[PDB]
Design a protein around this ligand. Sequence first.
Ligand code: NI
Ligand code: NI
Lengths: 102, 102
Amino acid sequence: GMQTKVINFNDKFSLFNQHWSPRVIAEMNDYQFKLVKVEGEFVWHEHADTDEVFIVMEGTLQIAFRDQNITLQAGEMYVIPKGVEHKPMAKEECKIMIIEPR
Amino acid sequence: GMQTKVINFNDKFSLFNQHWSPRVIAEMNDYQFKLVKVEGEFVWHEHADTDEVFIVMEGTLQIAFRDQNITLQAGEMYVIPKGVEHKPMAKEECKIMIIEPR
Ligand code: NI
Ligand code: NI
């Protein structure tokens, strides 16, 4: 049945504990919805050809930009415009969802 | 500055009470993230050329299909494949997010 394809975020987060390792949970056209557990600092990087979306599901995420840091709480999102250098970070474990093209 | 671009779902949902009237809260490439308040039944329809994502933020949503029904709670999502007829319904007010091409 179609109900089996209803995705529960909490159920999906329970399946892995590894950090900085996105899990694809759904596809929409040529885009993917990915769950990630993060802690500590990522690296400075950019996506030259696409905007990237961060939705915080649980915890507190920071994203460093060249002149400022932004803070995202649970129930908040941000669109990183294409070509913009950034470095995601989390003081404690943070549960996020990323949406971007395949 | 850039913190002004952080989107809080509760803050956006509090800006309107009108039902079945999606409000665009963000854009990712040629896609839109839209918030909607729904209650009662919609109509049977399809999107021939695109998948459509529903994410329930608060309440309970039912989506009727021609052969079966699914139920989504807060913290759950479903991808309606392109060309598939469906009719969203909510017994009580339900807060949702829809993601699809502009
Ligand atoms: Ni990135
Ligand atoms: Ni629809």
